[PDB]
Paper text:
Initial two-dimensional (2D) class averages calculated from cryo-EM micrographs of full-length wild-type unliganded [name] indicated a mixture of apparent tetramers and trimers with an approximate ratio of 90:10, largely consistent with results from negative stain EM. To our surprise, three-dimensional (3D) reconstructions from cryo-EM data clearly indicated that the tetrameric particles were in fact octamers of just prenyltransferase domains. The cryo-EM structure of the prenyltransferase octamer was solved to 3.99 Å resolution. Each prenyltransferase domain consists of residues 414–718. The overall molecular symmetry of the octamer appears to be D4, but subtle structural differences confer overall C2 symmetry. However, the Hα-2 and Hα-3 helices that partially cap the active site differ in monomers A/A’ compared with monomers B/B’. Thus, the octamer can be described as a tetramer of dimers. All active sites open inward to the central pore of the octamer, so substrate access to and product dissociation from the prenyltransferase domains is achieved exclusively through the central pore. The more notable structural differences are mainly the Hα-2 and Hα-3 helices that partially cap the active site, which pivot outward in the octamer compared with the hexamer. Curiously, the cyclase domains are not apparent in 2D class averages and hence are not resolved in 3D reconstructions of the prenyltransferase octamer.
[name] from [name] ([name]) is a unique bifunctional terpenoid synthase that catalyzes the first two steps in the biosynthesis of the diterpene glycoside Fusicoccin A, a mediator of 14-3-3 protein interactions. Each catalytic domain of [name] adopts the characteristic α-fold of a class I terpenoid synthase with αα domain architecture: the C-terminal α domain is a prenyltransferase that generates GGPP, and the N-terminal α domain is a cyclase that utilizes GGPP to form tricyclic fusicoccadiene; these domains are connected by a flexible polypeptide linker ~70 residues long. The prenyltransferase domain of [name] generates geranylgeranyl diphosphate, which the cyclase domain then utilizes to generate fusicoccadiene, the tricyclic hydrocarbon skeleton of Fusicoccin A. Here, we use cryo-electron microscopy to show that the structure of full-length [name] consists of a central octameric core of prenyltransferase domains, with the eight cyclase domains radiating outward via flexible linker segments in variable splayed-out positions. Cryo-electron microscopy and chemical crosslinking experiments additionally show that compact conformations can be achieved in which cyclase domains are more closely associated with the prenyltransferase core. This structural analysis provides a framework for understanding substrate channeling, since most of the geranylgeranyl diphosphate generated by the prenyltransferase domains remains on the enzyme for cyclization to form fusicoccadiene.
Residue numbers in the entry:
A (entry chain D), D (entry chain H): 414 to 577, 581 to 611, 624 to 717
B (entry chain C), C (entry chain G): 414 to 611, 623 to 718
Write the structure that this text describes.
């Protein structure tokens, strides 16, 4: 009937939903709801909207990096074919927009529309630097990371500032905290995924090493010419392993995390002092990293 | 520099922005404008957004059906890779959705996006059939063709009408126009099909001819089993493809779509004459659009 | 010398003539003899012909499902090649049909072959489903299982009864016996299935479990799409196979066949008690046959 | 319904039937009906029975020699898979037996049952000599050929002698003509198929050359060791081509045909003189070769 055509379109989403999600986009909102304090009948709807947007982000990601198994279960790219996964991810983002064009928000449609166009620009960069071997710089890797991960919490917050009653004075001093939390969470996720293979999959633990001016040019010319001629040899695979240990990129991630925290605990304090009410939970949210 | 990011993202959509489309969406919009009588500023922004949706559908369709040379240049999938064109298409769809929002919000645009998710339910039906091999019926196949090809004309008309003049009959012509759009989209899909079989796409997709043959009790088993061996071996043969061409030549397949195209053509002709009697004047453009369908 | 031709033809069937079958057709025939009370010359020729049909079905089945090690030796397909085992199987089927003709022709044997062509309509249904991927229903799946596994027991019983004693109730027990055969064959197929899932055959075939899952609206799409990708890539994975095992563990699949096996077991038990009241004495062998079904 | 399960089993047969059959098994019976003169309501049934038996023979053959295209259209082995073609060929022979267990014949069931067991023995030999490289001898190749082709006309005639009224005096002097016509027709078919590739596909035009004691041992050792090590080289493929020309196997087929004819025209004469009625058609049947 109609339920058939409706449950076949939403089948890949129904497969990615049953995954044991970390529950951060649904906890950051629960921690941001301590300050903004929107009604439950609305915060739940916004949580649903950011949840479908993020699950569709995973749907596009798990295909945009060919991986038979993402975590525990097999990857949607490897179960429903590839054409089905793409044609359901696109429908899912449009459905989330229509969910945002509703009670989620009325007049600031351009606000979330632009904050989604940023989310796709910050991803095209990753696909470009992987498909074209064009190694980045930290001034651009941090740009991309904040252009692809933080642009989800940005929509998550820009819709909670459209419902929550002071003024937008917090905005300029609230977005900052959003982008900071987003970058730190991506960095923590990369760290846990590391503790390696290349094949066009950059990270902080690689943009710090491939720019270490000691043995830098050896690196900028080891990946290439080998990634063309097959993939890599066997002593070369150990070479970069021992190279990452040299300057200890794995410790620059620790240092940047030790700076994102002390940047968070001074950025949360801005909100804690703007509104005269502590937040015994958002300070505990930092246990994520 | 954003000047570079904003041009690596748009790069795929720019690659088929200049392809020789020989499209008809433009002619249909310039023919509906003969009735709606909207300012040229409007008929410009509408074409400059429905063309984005169309080219985005091309990226999204001409990639699942991995093709080679298209008009002298290879398919956008093989050049920019699969992962990059998908991201550019998902962005370009949102770019057009944002373009729509700007021109108008009165009379609601929550029914202009609810008319795009239908354009993806249709493609979802098609990509579920071609993948899981489930043969369609005849009514279900017509439903998918209406959902997938005609829905883009439906978006264009539902955006045109929403800023038509604020005069005119308004709603008293809306449902009639929507029926005209459905029949016109169905004809323009079925005509490209009948031109393809004058076949060559037996690698997975489902034309109306295939729906005619697989449903006739004579040789129904044979054709069903041929498609299964094809999808099992990834392409049938140059010999088995000649067998399917001979089934088409046997069951009078090129005579059953013609008897459907020539029927939908007279139906569209009756529909257009019904539009010229609903507080409207002649449209020698629409009757020149039907001539572009053999 | 014919001594060589007559031994290269019989060579494949002789290769599984000594395989450790652990079969049950013999036990069932020796249990039906407890009722029919036929001369041992009969109960010998019957087993020496229904065993030929069974081993021939093995050649014909264990070849389409190209397998490797079977009981410590490879499948008869890989040793003698596909073309040679098929010819030996088609000959051995006719050898058993000719064997049947000899023992008896009164009461007609034109209904003993009409009960073998059913055993091939069943296998034809199975080889059309596994090939063209058409999912079965539940009643159609039970029909195929009755046609394919139970029909060999039906041949044995319709040959036993046709020379049962010329005394006995005769026809007044024929239809009851035929219902007993159908239920017993269905149980012995479903039990081998439930033992296979304590799975490992997701390369094309269709167990009852697969018919339970693909029919439940929850995750019906997921499982259908997994089987399509499997049959498209020729085998799914070691990862996707674990996904199907987790669906089985989720939808309570190993609890729905058990609720069907334990139902068919009580049904068979009631049927056997109904046979002991139809001018017959106890059969402590039949009630020891049911114990060989967990 | 029931028509479904009935038309799926008989679908491969329905595909091999639409082929443009030569129409020999339905013409040999029409030419044998001149002497025996059975009723039409019976000769048609026997023609149907031998037609399904022969179409099932083709079904097993076209799979037992892997060929994507037999003639004009594609091969049943390459359309319905392989498991379907086998499981319909077997059903077709059983159905033909049941058609023979009827009006076709009543009491002489063993006659046609044995004449079908011979038809499968005469084929197992071919599959053995192909699957095992065991080159035959003419004393065995003629045996196999008469054991595989003539055993169809044999059933075609043994059922017309079960309906047709003299005695079985003709039998012993009628079977001979059947087997002679069967061998000559197979030889004519092989000749037309030749006027080559090996891969275990013997013929008269090969059993005559691979036994030509001049260059014989070179042949018995050229095929093997090469058919294992890949297939063949490029000068070797021309070698046997020029070898067949040497002794002219292609002319021993002509000589054996020039003997089968003069053997036929003296075997048909036996029937022509036994019953005092000429046959202006069976003499014209010989135009097949």
């Amino acid at each position: 009937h109609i339920f058939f055509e409706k449950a076949v379109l939403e089948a890949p989403y129904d497969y990615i939903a049953s995954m044991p999600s970390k529950g951060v986009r649904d906890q950051f909102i629960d921690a941001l709801n301590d300050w903004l304090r929107v009604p439950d009948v609305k915060v739940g709807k916004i949580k649903d909207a950011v949840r479908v947007l993020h699950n569709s982000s995973l749907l596009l990601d798990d295909f945009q990096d060919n991986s038979p198994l993402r975590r525990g279960k097999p990857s949607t790219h490897n179960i429903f074919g590839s054409a089905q996964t793409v044609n359901t991810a696109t429908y899912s983002i449009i459905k989330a927009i229509g969910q945002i064009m509703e009670f989620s928000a009325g007049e600031s449609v351009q606000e979330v529309m632009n904050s989604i166009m940023i989310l796709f620009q910050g991803q095209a960069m990753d696909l470009f630097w992987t498909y074209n071997g064009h190694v980045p710089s930290e001034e651009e890797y941090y740009r991309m990371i904040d252009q692809k991960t933080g642009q989800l919490f940005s929509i998550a917050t820009s819709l909670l500032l459209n419902a929550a009653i002071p003024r937008t004075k917090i905005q300029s001093c609230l977005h900052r905290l959003t982008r900071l939390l987003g970058r730190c969470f991506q960095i923590r996720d990369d760290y846990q995924n590391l503790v390696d293979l290349d094949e066009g999959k950059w990270s902080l633990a690689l943009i710090h090493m491939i720019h270490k001016q000691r043995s830098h040019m050896a690196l900028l010319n080891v990946l290439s010419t080998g990634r063309k001629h097959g993939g890599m040899t066997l002593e070369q695979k150990q070479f970069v392993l021992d190279i990452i240990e040299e300057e200890k990129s794995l410790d620059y991630t620790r240092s940047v995390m030790m700076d994102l925290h002390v940047q968070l605990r001074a950025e949360i304090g801005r909100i804690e002092i703007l509104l005269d009410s502590p937040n015994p939970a958002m300070r505990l949210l930092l246990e994520l990293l």
